Structure formats: C-alpha cells, structure tokens
Amino acid sequence: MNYNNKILVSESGLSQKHLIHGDEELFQHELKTIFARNWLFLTHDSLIPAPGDYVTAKMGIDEVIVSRQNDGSIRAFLNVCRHRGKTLVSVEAGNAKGFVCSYHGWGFGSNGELQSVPFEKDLYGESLNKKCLGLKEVARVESFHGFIYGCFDQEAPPLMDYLGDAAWYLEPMFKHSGGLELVGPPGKVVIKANWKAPAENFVGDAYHVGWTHASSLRSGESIFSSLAGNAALPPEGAGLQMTSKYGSGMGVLWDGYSGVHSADLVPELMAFGGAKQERLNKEIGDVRARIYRSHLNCTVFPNNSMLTCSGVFKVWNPIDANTTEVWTYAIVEKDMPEDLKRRLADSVQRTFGPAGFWESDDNDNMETASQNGKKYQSRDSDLLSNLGFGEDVYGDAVYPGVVGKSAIGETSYRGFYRAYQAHVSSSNWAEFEHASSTWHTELTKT
Amino acid sequence: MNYNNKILVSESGLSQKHLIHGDEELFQHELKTIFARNWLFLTHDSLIPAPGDYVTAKMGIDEVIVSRQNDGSIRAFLNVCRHRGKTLVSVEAGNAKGFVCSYHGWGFGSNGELQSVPFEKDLYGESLNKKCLGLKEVARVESFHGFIYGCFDQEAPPLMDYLGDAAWYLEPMFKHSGGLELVGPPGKVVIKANWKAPAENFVGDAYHVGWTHASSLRSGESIFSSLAGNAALPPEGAGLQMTSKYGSGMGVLWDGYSGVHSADLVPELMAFGGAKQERLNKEIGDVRARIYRSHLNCTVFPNNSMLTCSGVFKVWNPIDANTTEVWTYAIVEKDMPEDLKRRLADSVQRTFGPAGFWESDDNDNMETASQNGKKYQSRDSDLLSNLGFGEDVYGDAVYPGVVGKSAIGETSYRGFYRAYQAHVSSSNWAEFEHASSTWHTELTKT
Amino acid sequence: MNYNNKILVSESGLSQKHLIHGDEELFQHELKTIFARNWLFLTHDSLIPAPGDYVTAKMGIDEVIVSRQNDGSIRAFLNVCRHRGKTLVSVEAGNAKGFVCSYHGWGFGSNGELQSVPFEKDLYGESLNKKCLGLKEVARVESFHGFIYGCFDQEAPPLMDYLGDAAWYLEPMFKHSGGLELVGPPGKVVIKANWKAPAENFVGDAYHVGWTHASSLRSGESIFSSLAGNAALPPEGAGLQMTSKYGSGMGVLWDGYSGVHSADLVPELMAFGGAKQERLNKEIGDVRARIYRSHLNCTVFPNNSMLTCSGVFKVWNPIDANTTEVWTYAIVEKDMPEDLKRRLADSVQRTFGPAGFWESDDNDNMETASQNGKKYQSRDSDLLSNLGFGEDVYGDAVYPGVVGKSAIGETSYRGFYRAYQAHVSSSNWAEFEHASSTWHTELTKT
Amino acid sequence: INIQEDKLVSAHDAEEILRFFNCHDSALQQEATTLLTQEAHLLDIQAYRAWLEHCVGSEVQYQVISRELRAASERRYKLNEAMNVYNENFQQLKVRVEHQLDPQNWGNSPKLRFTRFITNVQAAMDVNDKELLHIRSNVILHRARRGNQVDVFYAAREDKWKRGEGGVRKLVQRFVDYPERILQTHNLMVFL
Amino acid sequence: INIQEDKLVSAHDAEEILRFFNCHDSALQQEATTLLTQEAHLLDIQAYRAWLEHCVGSEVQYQVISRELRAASERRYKLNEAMNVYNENFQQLKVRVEHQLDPQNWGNSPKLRFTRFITNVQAAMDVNDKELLHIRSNVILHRARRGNQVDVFYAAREDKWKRGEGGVRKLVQRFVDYPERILQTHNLMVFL
Amino acid sequence: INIQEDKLVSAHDAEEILRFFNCHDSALQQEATTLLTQEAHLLDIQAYRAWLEHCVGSEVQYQVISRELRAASERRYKLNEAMNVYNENFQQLKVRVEHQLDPQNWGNSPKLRFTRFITNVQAAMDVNDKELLHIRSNVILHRARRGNQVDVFYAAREDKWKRGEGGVRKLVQRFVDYPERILQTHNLMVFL
Numbered sequence A, B, C: 001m002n003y004n005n006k007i008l009v010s011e012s013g014l015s016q017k018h019l020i021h022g023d024e025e026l027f028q029h030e031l032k033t034i035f036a037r038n039w040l041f042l043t044h045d046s047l048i049p050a051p052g053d054y055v056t057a058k059m060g061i062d063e064v065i066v067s068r069q070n071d072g073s074i075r076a077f078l079n080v081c082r083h084r085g086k087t088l089v090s091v092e093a094g095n096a097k098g099f100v101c102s103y104h105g106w107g108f109g110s111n112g113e114l115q116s117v118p119f120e121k122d123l124y125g126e127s128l129n130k131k132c133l134g135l136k137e138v139a140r141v142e143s144f145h146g147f148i149y150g151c152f153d154q155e156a157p158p159l160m161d162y163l164g165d166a167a168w169y170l171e172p173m174f175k176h177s178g179g180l181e182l183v184g185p186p187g188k189v190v191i192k193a194n195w196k197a198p199a200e201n202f203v204g205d206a207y208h209v210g211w212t213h214a215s216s217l218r219s220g221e222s223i224f225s226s227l228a229g230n231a232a233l234p235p236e237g238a239g240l241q242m243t244s245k246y247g248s249g250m251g252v253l254w255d256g257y258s259g260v261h262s263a264d265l266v267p268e269l270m271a272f273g274g275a276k277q278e279r280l281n282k283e284i285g286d287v288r289a290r291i292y293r294s295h296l297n298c299t300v301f302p303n304n305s306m307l308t309c310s311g312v313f314k315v316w317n318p319i320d321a322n323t324t325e326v327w328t329y330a331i332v333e334k335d336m337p338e339d340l341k342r343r344l345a346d347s348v349q350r351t352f353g354p355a356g357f358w359e360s361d362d363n364d365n366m367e368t369a370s371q372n373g374k375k376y377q378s379r380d381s382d383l384l385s386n387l388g389f390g391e392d393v394y395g396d397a398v399y400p401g402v403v404g405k406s407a408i409g410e411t412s413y414r415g416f417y418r419a420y421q422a423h424v425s426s427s428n429w430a431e432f433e434h435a436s437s438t439w440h441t442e443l444t445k446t
Numbered sequence D, E, F: 001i002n003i004q005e006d007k008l009v010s011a012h013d014a015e016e017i018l019r020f021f022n023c024h025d026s027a028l029q030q031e032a033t034t035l036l037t038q039e040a041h042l043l044d045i046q047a048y049r050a051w052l053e054h055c056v057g058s059e060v061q062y063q064v065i066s067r068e069l070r071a072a073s074e075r076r077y078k079l080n081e082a083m084n085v086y087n088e089n090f091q092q093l094k095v096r097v098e099h100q101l102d103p104q105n106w107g108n109s110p111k112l113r114f115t116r117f118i119t120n121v122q123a124a125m126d127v128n129d130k131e132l133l134h135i136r137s138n139v140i141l142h143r144a145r146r147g148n149q150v151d152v153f154y155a156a157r158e159d160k161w162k163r164g165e166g167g168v169r170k171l172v173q174r175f176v177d178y179p180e181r182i183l184q185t186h187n188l189m190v191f192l
C-alpha cells in the first residue's frame, strides 16, 4: 500500500477505511510514523520518586527502562544490551544504581553508560570504546505535571505544544488541583483489539455509554446512572467535545466529579470536588474551576487515555493489528485523604481494571470492530465519524480548540483521525506540519 | 507471485503445485478470485422457514446474516454495523424483525435497512442519510430445491447454470424424491488443513476409501464393508465419475443407498430407497430413478460437499491456508418417517460429525498433505491427479458432463482444478468464461 | 530486502544487524541459502545400524526419512508421498523394507522407489511411470566417523572439505578414540529463539559461562566450577578458539575431559580420558592426544552443535525466526564400559537435556536476544562480536584455521557470521566460493 | 433455586442441583470417586474392552451434545436446539471400541497418550429408583500424539450408574453438554 | 519452614503451611470438599444469587491481587506492591451479580459456559477463633463463549469460612494472589 | 486385563491396574491424598529444602522419561526406547534444589509462580513389602513467569512411598512417562 497516496481517512476525518483496524502492513507502518514519532506515556514521578528508582515501560512494541537520575531528572533507555542484544531488566520496577546483563555480565549505569565489562583488561585491553556503548537512549523525555512522556524523535514538538488546545482542559485537574499521583502497579490485560479501538472510544465516544454500559449504569448507581439503556439523553449544555492539531481530544461532561464510582463514593467525592472548586473559582475563574470537577474522557494521542474524576488512566500498548496490552492505573489528587485515595484506586480497578465490570462491557465492541477490519468484504468499507459535522467551531472566546458544543458527538474522532492520516502519509515532523497547516479549517467545514 | 502467468495447475488438471495447500498469499488471492466470485452455501429453507427466522453463515472469511423476509424471499447481509463496524449478531440462529448494535444502538431491519438511530433527531437532526446506510447486502441469493446459496459477485451465472452438468445427477435426490430437509444445528470443528484438501477428497476420491477407512469399514459393517483394507475392488460398472465447467463434480456408486450407515440402518434404508425408486422409474426413467438411490460423493465448487444417501452435508469454511472450520449437517428426505430422520441424523454425526469415526480417519491425511505445502522442498512439487486420464468422455447419450465410466479415478479432481486455475488467473467472470471456452476438450485429451 | 546488497554482517564479522534474529523474510531466505545449500546433521550409524533401520530427521523445515540400505549405504528421502503429498512416516524410528501411504496405499521401498500401487493393473493399466515416481531423494549423504549428514545441493563440497580446519580438532575424539556412538532417543524441546542464538553460543561463547551458568557451576561442582559468578578467569593458555572457511568453529578448553559432569563422574572420566591420552601420544602426538581429552564447544555450520567430553550433541531445528526445536543426544566413546556410557548419557540429559539445569540458564538469554530482533528500535542495531579482533592468526604451525590463542573471545562468531553473510548474498556454491576467496585475510585484519 | 430470580439458570440445571443439596451421604461420594477414578484409569491406558466390560451397562445411553448459540431473550425460534456428537447405545460404543483397536487404524500409530483429571465428584441415590445412583463429575482430558499435537477437553458429566452383573456398578447414562461450540481440538474422538 | 534456609519461600506462605501440617482432621477436609464443590456447582450454572445467599457471608472480603514483578534481591523500592483486581464487600459482590443478571448485559448473550475444577483441598480450624475454618484449595476455571473464545484461569485460594444464618458455613474471606501478571484471557470477569 | 484382547494396552499398564482393583482401603486413599496435597503445597511455594526433608526418601529414584515414537506394529527395531529427562538420586535432587535457591540463578528473578492440581489418587500396599505404599496420581502443573510466559504440564505419576525418619512417609520412587514427545513449555524444569 502506498501511504503517501492512499486515502485511509477521508477529508475532515468524516470516515476511515475499516482495514486500519486489521491491516498488519499498516501496523508495521504505524510503528514508524505513529509510535516512533509521537509522545508516549512512560510513568509518573510518584512511581519513581527517588534517585535510582526505575520502571519498565513500552513505547510502541519497544521496551524501555525509565530511571530517576541522581540530579533529579529522568532518562529512558532501550531495555536491550549493547553487546549481543539480551533484555537487560526482567522486572517491572525497582531501585538500582545500574543494570547487569545476565548473558555476559556487562554493567550499565542508571544513566545508560557502559560502566563495567567483566575482565575488560584481560580480554579487551584498551580496545573497547565503552563511551560509544551506552544504552540506546530515548531522545526526548518531558513531564506534564508529573506525568512523564517519551519520544524517540528528536524533532518532535515540546510535549506542552504537542498537547495543544487539550492542555487548557487538563490543567485545572493536573495543575491547579495541587497535583495528581498515579497509583500503581497497573492492571495488565491483553485484548484482541487494535489499539485505535479503545483510543478512539476514550477520545470521543459519549454516544456509546448509555447502550454499551446499560448494565453497569443500572447496577452501580453511579452519578451517570440516568443514561442506562438510552433511557435518557443528557440535557442541552450538559457538555462539550474538543480536539486539537496533534490529535489529542476529549469530551467534557459538566460537574460529573464522582464519575463512574458507585453510590458508596458519590457523596464524599461530590463534597471534596465542590469544596476545591469553591477555592479555585478565585484562582482560575468559574469556568476553569468547573472544568476541574467535570468528567473528562481524553486521549493523549496516540495511545494514552484517561477519565478524570473517575480517575481511570490507560495505556493501549500495541502488539499487532488485533492485539493490545491494556495497562490500567488510578489517578488521585495528592491532597485527598489517604483512605479516600485507597478507596478511589480500588474503585478505578473495580470498574475499569482487569475485572472492571464497565470495561468488560466494551470488550466485544472493540474486539469485533477490530477483527472485522481483516475480513475481505469489510477492508475497503467506511467507518463513519460524521456526527456533529458542520457544527464545530474554532477560536471560541471561552473554550479553545476545535469544539463541538454538545455532550455527544464525533468531533474528537475527526481530530484524532485527521492527525493520524497526516502522520501516516508523512516521513517526518516537517511533513506532518505541512499536512496540518489548515487543520482546524478542515475540521470545521460544512 | 503473478497469478496471470503462474502455472499452479497443469494442462488438463493433471497435476497441481503442492504450494496451493500452504501459500498464504495465494489464500488471500482466493478470497478475491474464489470466495468473492463463486456460489457459497448459506442454509436451507428448513432452518429459516418462517418470516423473521435467521441464521449466521460464513462466506469465505466473511460472516453474513441470512434472513427470511416477510414476502417469503431470503436476503443476506454482512454481519457488520454500518457505523463503526461492530459485529451485529453474536448468535447462530433465531427469530427477529431486526438487529440492534450493542455499541451505539443502531437498529437494522431483517431487510437490512437502517431503521433507527438512538436520539437521531437530537443528534443528527435531518442530516443522516439512513437510506444509504443499510447493511452491505450479498448481491445474489438463490435456491436449489431449498438449499440456499449466496454470491457476492452480481456477474455470476445463475446458480442452476453454475451447477452445470452436476445438476442432472443431484435432481433425483434433491427434486424428484419429494425434497430434502437439512437437520441442524451443524457440528463445528477446526482442522489444520487447507479447505481444498477435503473439497478435492469429496469431489473425486473413491480411491482412498478402502485404505484410509479400512478400520471404519471393518468396524461399522456398512454396505461398502467389502472394501476394507483394499480387500476387494468394486466390480466393473460399479459406478462413474463426473465433472463440469464451473468445477462441481461427483462420484456415483450404484445402488449404495444405505451409504456409510451401520448395519443397524441398512435394512430400513435399503427398503425405503428401493420403494421410492420403484415409483420414480415411471416418472423419471430407470437410470435416473437408480441415480436417486445411488451414493453420490459431491463437491459443489468451491467448498460445499455432500454424500447423498449417507446424508452427510459439509461446508469447508476457510480460515487460513492451513486452517478450515468444518460444518457438518445431516440431509434427510422430507417424506421419511420422523423416527428414521432422527436416527439418520444421529448416524451422520456418528460417522462424519465432530466425533465421526469415519471423518477421523481422514484427519492426518488432510492435515499433513496441507501442511507439507508449506515445506520448502515440497512447494514446487507436483500433486498428481492423472488416474483415468485419456479415458474420460463428454456428451455421452446417457450421463452428462465430463465422465469417467469407472467407479474409481481422478476425473473429478481434474475438473475441480481446471476451474480453480481458470478463476485464480482471471479478474472477473468474463475472463473465466474466456479461459473455459474449451473446458471439456482440455479434460478429455489423451 | 535486497540480500545481494544488504550488509547484515559487517566486514570481518565484527557485528551483525539485530534483525537477523527476528526477520521472517530473512528466515524464508535462509531456507534457500542456508538450509537447502549446506550440510545438516541427520543421524548416527549407531541409531540405524542394520538393513531396514530408519529414522526421521529434519533438514531445515523439511522432514526426511533416513534409511539403511541392504548394501550398507544410507539414503534419505523427503517424508512426502509422491501422489497427493501426505506425510509417509509418522514415527521417529523403526525397521522396515518400505513405507505405505495411509491415504491411498502407495508403497515405497526403503530405497525410495515406488514399488506398489493398489489395483495398479485395474486402475492405471500400464500408464503409471513408477520409475519416475520415487520419493524425492536428498542429493548428498555422507559420514564423518559414523555421524551422517545430508545436503539437498548436489554442488556442495564433500563433507570432509566442508568441515575445513575444524576436522583436525574433531578427529582425535571422533576418529582416534576408537569412535563414538550417539545414544538416542534425543530429548526434544521447543524454545522461542532463533536457531542462530544457540548456534553462535556453542560455536564461540566461552565468555558467558561464568556468569550465565553461575548457579550450575556453583551447584554441580563440575571441573569448571571455579568460573562461577566470574569469580575467576581461566589461566593464560587455558585454551584457544578457531574458525574455518565454511563457517564451522569451536573453542578448546585444555584438559577438561569431565566437562560439565558433576563430581559424581569426575574421577572416572578423568582417569579414562587420561589413560587413552597416554596411548594416543604415541599414535597422533602429544598435542593431538591432548586435544582428544580437551573440551571442545563446536558448531558444525549451520545448526549442529556439540560439547565433546561433556558429550552433549545438539540440533537447532528451525521453525520460524523466533522458534527452534532443540534435539539433544549424548555422545559416548564406544570402548567405554557400558555402565559408564549409561551414566554419561543420563548426565548429558541432566545438564543439557529437556530438564537440563545448565541449558535452562541459557533460555532467557537466547529467547530475549532473538525476540528483541523484531522490536522496531533494535532491528537496525548492531550485535557486537569484536572481542579478540586483531589478535587472530591463520596458518599456525601447530593449530590450523583462523585461531585466537586465548580461551575466551569472539573469533568463532566472526567466522560463523562471515560464512553466513557469504551464503545469504550468494545464489549458489560458486558464488559463495567467490565471496570467500579471501576469507582468512578478512578475519585476521587489524 | 428460583429461576425467575436467578435469571441465568436453566430449569434443568436447577433440578440437578436440588439432587445433591438434599441427602449428603459421605460414603457414597467416596464410592463414586473410586468408580470414576478406576473408569478414568482404564480409559487412560486405552483398555477400551475392559472399560466396556467393567464400567458400561448393557442399557447405556452415552450422549454428548453441542447446543446451537441462541439469544438469551429468544422465545420464537423453535427448531432443534442441539446435535449429538455422541448418542450411543452399547452396540454403538462397541463399534467405536473395535475401531480404536483395529490394526489398520492408522491414526493410532504411534500410540496416543491420554491423561484424565476427574474432579468435583457428587453422588446421590435416586429417590424413586433406590438402585439408581446419580453421579456428577467434571473432567479435563489431555490427548497427546505425533510429537506436537496436544488437545485438551473440558466438560461436566451427568451420569447414572446402576448395579449389574456380579453386583458391579456400571454406567447406564452419561450426558455431557459440551461447553465449546466450535471444537479447537481437531475432533471430539475421545471418551469423556 | 525456615525461610532463611528455604530462600525462595515468603513469610506469608510459610505461615499458611504451618496451619495445615499440625492438626489434621479428616472429617473437616471432607466437609470443606463438599462446601467447595457445591459452591463451584452454583457458580458453574450461573446461579449467582443462590451463590450469594448460600455461600457468601455478610462480612465477606473477596480479594484477588496482581503483584508487580520486582527483583528477588530488591530491598529499597517500597511502593504499593500489588493492585486489587477484586477487593469486594458483600454489597460490591451484589453489584457484580446484578450486572451479570441484567438483561442488557449484551456480553451474556449467547449464554456463557463455565466449568470449574477444584483440587488440593486442605482445611483447619483457627486456633484462636474456634468457629473460623481455614480452607485452601486450587481452581482451574474454564470459560467458553461465542463459538471459539476459550479462557482458562488457574489459582490458589486462601479462604476463611464461618457458620452464619441457619448454621450454614459461608465465605468470610477469599484471597487469591493471581499467578499470571499479564492476563491472556481478555479479562478476569470470573469468580475464582 | 487380557492384553491379547485389549490390543492397545501395555503389559506394564495392565500390571499397575491390577494393583488397585484388588484390595481397596478407603483410609489409605485418604492418607495418600493428604501426603500428595502437602507435597504439592511445599513445591508450589518453592519450599524445595522442606520438600527434600519432609517428602523425599534417602533411597529415592525420581524418574521422568520421554519415549521415542515407534510403530504400533514394530517388532524388530530394538534400541533404547526412551531417554531420561530426570533420573535422579537424592544427591542429584539436592543439586537441583541448590540450583533453584542460588542467588545467581537469574531466571528465578522475578520469582516464578507455581500452581499444582493433583487428582485421581489411588493407593495400595505392596503385597510382598508390607511397608511399601504404591500411590498413583495425576498432576496438572501451571508455571507462570515474566509477565506473559505460561507453561502447563500434564502427567500421571507412579509412586512408591515408605516410612522413614520419625515414621514420616517419604517418596522412594516416582516414575513418569511424559505424554508429550516434543515439549512446548520451553523446558521441563519443574518437579512433577
């Protein structure tokens, strides 16, 4: 397939070829044009707070070691020995000043440097140029309020610029709340879906909630319970949708601070969020204080998603076109009481973890939609994302980004897939930028 | 591989490259040139007799919903939602006026039309062109005496013409018997064989029976028991072989109406078939009345096979070059006593079902022959189908088609593979027809 | 990938692209340029000593039948029926005058000839040219002191010439000891590694032993126990490394006749080997008598490895780029007492068999190094084999081949990969020879 | 069990559970365990004639069904719900045993390897027929052949056993509703 | 067990084994086997309400953890070692049961098939609380759905059971440390 | 069993079954179940030293074979029929235990997870040696490591146990004929 020419996503992001969820050649191409190019979630300060602390993480199909340096910075390196290519670290987290290879015993520092080679003097003499044999380093590692992302491409925009108009919506919860912590370790489960299936669902899909999650809505008696079985549509002005240049987007459901949590947590949460909102009104203004305590369903392009307030934090780690390894963490506000943090973390896993009853509602939808992308009569068929098209705006005086001023629509799908198509058809960041110079105009056509 | 030029099947169908049973690129090519082009078995009237009744079926690797319409016709549709591509129907059979998608709740009629969209007015307004969003319909659906076949290619010959000279042999049992019923549900089992391995075996392979099925012949004491271990060759004039333009073929074993059924069913069956034959002599003539109560081992090209009289009915559903999902139904004559129908259905499954002891005899033969097609030194080797070549006729005064007047040979393999090669090397039906304008001459060379 | 031009192995074998352990297209290419071209281990005289005795063996991904003929020679044939391609023989070893196909009953002799066809006269008449329907024969089958190798390529060098300078090192144990026997049946275990990972390890890797096998060294108290955990480096002059034109190579660890065997066998073995050495001094000279009772870790290119004295004999049978079926036999000296042979065979399996505690130490190293070759950021990375480069010699007055006069280095990796690259980039043996006309000069550069 | 409240439970399943919750006879559970362990041993070593002679009653029905997948809410479509993978009388079992033992059963060379794991044994005497013993048990069945073929079967068995010749308890009914609709084991040619 | 000598053994595991090696009560092992077999039967037929009523105590903690992979030699990194796949009180189990039974639980049509294999049963009374019964058992759980989906779960269960309403022994704690870190079963939406 | 009639049955298998069909001692079966459950618990928690001390006799032979695939009709080829995956005395088992416990056994970090399922227990005293107990049992062994590696082993075990130090019954012979010829579990580095 010629990715320069093939129209995988139609103009304005209105539709996508179903093969994108099934084609293995395209998957291999995404490794280059999506995963090797863009910012990918690694970890949180809270998980590697002290010098020597490390975790392993995936970046695409690659595995990296992410380590807190003595100077307080974080560096990340391929988890691959520079000698004969053995995986260096076989655990998920720890504290160490270095990593020794179990094959021939080469020792690398927490800073990636080749520090020791067994019997170097007797074997290599002065011949081994250890300065040139450091672990292959992730070019870019940056933080968004403690959330650490990496990018293999030195040419990428800074992470803040990459978040584009989405950053404005995240900052009330990520910054102005006093900051968040990630509660680990994550749940980890393989699903037989393409990574884009859950990514698109979290970025933009409020339409599915009443029907897909009918049973979870009815059973948990969470705050959004009125939607069960499409019994009710949220009121006018119940929320909005947004998207951005580099593909990140989210839905906003006003005031839903207890999110998916069952009635057991609703009162405490609604009290806690409302109290903080009252304080934030004076600091960031009423609208942004309200956004703080509003439920955001977001994807940070390409494959990191979250539900703020619910506190669900996801990585859709790609394995092949119909296989994804799902990592699920909980996010909590640092100034919450410790007992509430514990209960909130358990509730995140109860609803969206490995045995998450809400997440389970999505399995067949994601898996079958992905697998159908391999079926001969569906490859060239068009997946539709036209809901709300011709009603989006850009440059609004209050809400930035390409915005649909309705709680339910497909605005965020269109922005996600516009960015996706621009990357797949581009050889580098300069080409993506050229392909995106009229991004918002394309999305707001009629 | 260049399918226009590559000789996969030699002139007159005398041999085939072993790679045809193993090559995954060729498998993908068959999805286009075999499965998307030809007639494929869906169901029987007996399984969807009433308005609203439906079943799911495979057509190649695609899945379709096959539904009885209010007007008594049958229509079939891809089992894929027109919104974001989720599989619509997750059951095998039922009765419904429509199908609702579990993702966002779109509702489709039994006639494929998009009938409802949740909150359409509030979300889409008047913008959604539901008339253009009906399920993707199978272009052609036709019946042969209650047996329903589908074809994705509008340009295909009518099903009757496609059966060609094979129809004449089937009609005594399918039509003149008063009609057949298919007893469901089918057994379903995955084997590690290419679909062509069982297809070629049923079309044309009487040679294997004595040796492959030595144990089943010895153990069941069925009517063909004398063949066990190649202890005896059927007499001269014990049967014939035939093939046809569009690839369908069969063997005929005269008088074997009890087929593979054990001695427990032999007397009742031989009485029942002989009584009907006596009545049919007057209606269709002695030869065709005898064909009615003769054992036909047939493949309806490409991947539907049967043993009449034994009542075995098979679909070799393709999964990949070395994986096939085998569906096994029983066929019974509608005017048989109900208790006999029940016993015959159980006996079909006893012999050829998931725990069919006869079918089990074939597993290693089919699986290893297929898997060897992947092995480097065998890819370019020649599978032989020359038995009987130079003794076939066409245009016989009594038996139509390309015919070998012997019970055991490879006539039907040659016709099957001639049609296969003509499709694989053609881009459409017009090209197949051009490639087949001397089909019978090619098959009867010396 | 263009294998004529792609530099997969750098000049002098100093490095290899990591993708060689993961790339499936390259694996398919190796079937042609490595496995269909070179000499591959089949069996030993001791396993098929009498007329009619046979075994099955893999040659690459192909399976062959290896049979002792009435005249005392050995012939090998593809395990594939010449009719419709069924696997002929489903057992691992036996005695027979022929093999009958379970599909249609064709009977082949131990000499590969098609000897009988059921009902030939009645079915084929005189038409079947059985003389042209013999099993596809392995072109070349030769013995090295009872060890039987095969090659599909008629143009290959004789096996003795193919062993090149390695033969000189093997002959003391293989020839001058009175001869070896292979004790079967082999252990058989699938590992998720590329075949080259264990092949390179056995050819050339003494560096890993102290660290990888720290626990096995500490626990068994074998003769090499001092190396555990890199506690000690072998003394100067403790051994050497060698390699050869056609890729075979080995390490030599002077005097280590008890090898990996635990203290329970050390005294008897060290007595037995020393006694034979004393006799051999007079016959082959002191140096070669010492080589007899020195531990050789060898790979006979491409995929047969061994540890002499330890008595471990391996075939790394390729399945795909990250799958290998490991066959493990024991080798024993024929004139050892039978009770010692039995104990030595059990100890070989105890240490290096399916539950071999030494072999288990290597699993993660081999598997992860192989699997990392598929990971996007590692494909184009360089595996290093530069240890000892610029200190190798050729044409030494005492030790032939390209030789590193140190116990630990990567000489043998460089020779293995030089030969590998020359084959992968060549279409036939003549081209390999042209690409290898300065093989030793390339390896001894500075 | 109230199946109007426990909405996922079938009438048949509710009836069967009532059978075991009521009179628990510890000794009967032990007898049942022995019977099933011995049966499984005979089958695992491929002593199929000994199995027929020692374990299987002359009036046996040996039945394994595969049920078509239907909607949980389905109430109109009323055609045959299941097919019989097995539905054998003693004679039919004997045919299958002779097929296994035939020296021209090519698929049995090299010899197959079976290993059965029987668990969750429950036993109760029938209320009306005081000589009929109901036994429920679950089986994992591992079949290995030809180097690298491995098939694992999983099932619940509803059995009736009764004393026959020499007072030996023998199987008079086995019923299995096989849990996997599409078999991924090449075939179901094993005695569950 | 001396865990300074048996270097691979955790303090928790050593404590649990001490519990069963000491007073062996054969009758208690049989009672425990019956309790667990009956529980598994109720779960297998999807009688989830009956399970709650007959098997689960009002004060239950039902917990399944997944432990992060850490170095065997690790002694400095001291952050949350595990997450809770399940950590449910009775109310939370009831929510999950209502979710299973809801007619708009689309994933339950066509009906799932469960088969559980319970083995290695050990039982001991608590020393201090003479009404608390410790039961250890292992489970293989087979879930089949939708033609060709097959998921098999494997776990050891550390349970406490106590007599409740009507003197019926009911589960008051279940603890499972799930052995597979990355699940390859689509989800863990089964009651182990 | 008559192995001339039951054509698929080996002489060895027929002998072993004769051992259990003859004197059934219910209490012995229970003792055997306890012994094996406790052994499996020790192994599952990786208490390998405790296993040696409590479960394994000084004169043990611990043997697991792999048999070459030969024709069912084969009668001429008479070379070694099997190889020993394990054939260990006490000393050799101790070497393997020290290997497991060594802190430089890199493959044991992160710690492995084992879960064993023991079923089909049969026990009989030896006729000639009244202190030798024959125990037959089947095992499913699940080994999970490194996030997504899962290996499942299946075997029948023919054991002899005898009272040793302190009157504790200990394993003096274990024999397993492993059913899968080509292992698909990376290795057989588990104690069956």
Ligand SMILES: c1ccc2c(c1)ccc1ccccc12
Binding pocket: A201, A202, A203, A204, A205, A206, A209, A224, A251, A253, A259, A260, A295, A297, A307
């Ligand atoms: C993915 C997952 C959950 C949600 C959304 C997207 C979108 C909206 C929403 C609203 C309430 C609860 C969950 C959600």
Ligand SMILES: c1ccc2c(c1)ccc1ccccc12
Binding pocket: B201, B202, B203, B204, B205, B206, B209, B224, B251, B253, B259, B260, B295, B297, B307
């Ligand atoms: C496939 C399967 C069974 C048969 C044939 C082909 C062909 C002839 C035949 C004749 C008797 C019984 C079965 C068969």
Ligand SMILES: c1ccc2c(c1)ccc1ccccc12
Binding pocket: C201, C202, C203, C204, C205, C206, C209, C224, C251, C253, C259, C260, C295, C297, C307
């Ligand atoms: C592969 C496997 C074992 C060895 C070597 C290579 C190389 C040297 C060596 C030396 C002692 C024991 C084992 C070995």
Ligand code: FES
Binding pocket: A081, A082, A083, A084, A085, A086, A101, A102, A103, A104, A105, A106
């Ligand atoms: S592969 Fe890491 S030290 Fe050699």
Ligand code: FES
Binding pocket: B081, B082, B083, B084, B085, B086, B101, B102, B103, B104, B105, B106
């Ligand atoms: S995918 Fe079917 S309604 Fe959206």
Ligand code: FES
Binding pocket: C081, C082, C083, C084, C085, C086, C101, C102, C103, C104, C105, C106
């Ligand atoms: S395939 Fe061997 S005789 Fe036909």
Ligand SMILES: [Fe+3]
Binding pocket: A201, A208, A209, A212, A213, A358, A361, A362
């Ligand atoms: Fe959802």
Ligand SMILES: [Fe+3]
Binding pocket: B201, B208, B209, B212, B213, B358, B361, B362
């Ligand atoms: Fe057949």
Ligand SMILES: [Fe+3]
Binding pocket: C201, C208, C209, C212, C213, C358, C361, C362
């Ligand atoms: Fe090693």
